[PDB]
Design a protein around this ligand. Structure first.
Ligand code: HEM
Length: 154
């Protein structure tokens, strides 16, 4: 797939608002993920044990994870499709070490869209949501292909 410049602009315009508060958005997104799809929490040996949303909010380790995920995703989106170098190490750890099925990347994509929609309604109308979904589909498609080369296509 290929986004147009206009679609990239919509994506990077709402992302610039996310970056005003990386840790807060990280928290919202992962908590939304873990509430919606509790199986995903099992992948994090560090936060596995957390039982409630209050515990999740209070967790410093969860908030670090969120910042790590969003910073890596931000660097990828800012490449505007030319992200082959950033993807390689990421596809290798998630295929071989963490073992994150593509289905889980779909779930977090849903969580990202949900949280942007709540927090940024004026900058996240239909066309901006369409452009973000396209960017995240592109990301999942390129990851899935690398998974296959690495022997996982999990
Ligand atoms: C937008 C998607 C994602 C991005 C860009 C992302 C990025 C990263 C980065 C940069 C790290 C640390 C370096 C490394 O281990 O490669 C990491 C670690 C990890 N990721 Fe991902 N990730 C994403 C989605 C997921 C999802 C959906 C899950 C699980 C349901 C997941 C589970 C983990 C785990 C278990 C770690 C290691 C945590 C630890 O330090 O103990 N990731 N991720």
């Amino acid at each position: 797939m290929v986004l147009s410049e206009g679609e990239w602009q919509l994506v990077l315009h709402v992302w610039a608002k996310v970056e005003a508060d990386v840790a807060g958005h990280g928290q919202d997104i992962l908590i939304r993920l873990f509430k919606s799809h509790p199986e995903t929490l099992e992948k994090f040996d560090r936060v596995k044990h957390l039982k409630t949303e209050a515990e999740m909010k209070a967790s410093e380790d969860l908030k670090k994870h969120g910042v790590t995920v969003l910073t890596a995703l931000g660097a990828i989106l800012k490449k505007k499709g030319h992200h082959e170098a950033e993807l390689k190490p990421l596809a290798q750890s998630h295929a071989t070490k963490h073992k994150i099925p593509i289905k889980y990347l779909e779930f977090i994509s849903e969580a990202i869209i949900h949280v942007l929609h709540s927090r940024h309604p004026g900058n996240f109308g239909a066309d901006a949501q369409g452009a973000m979904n396209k960017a995240l589909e592109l990301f999942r498609k390129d990851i899935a292909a690398k998974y296959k080369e690495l022997g996982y296509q999990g």
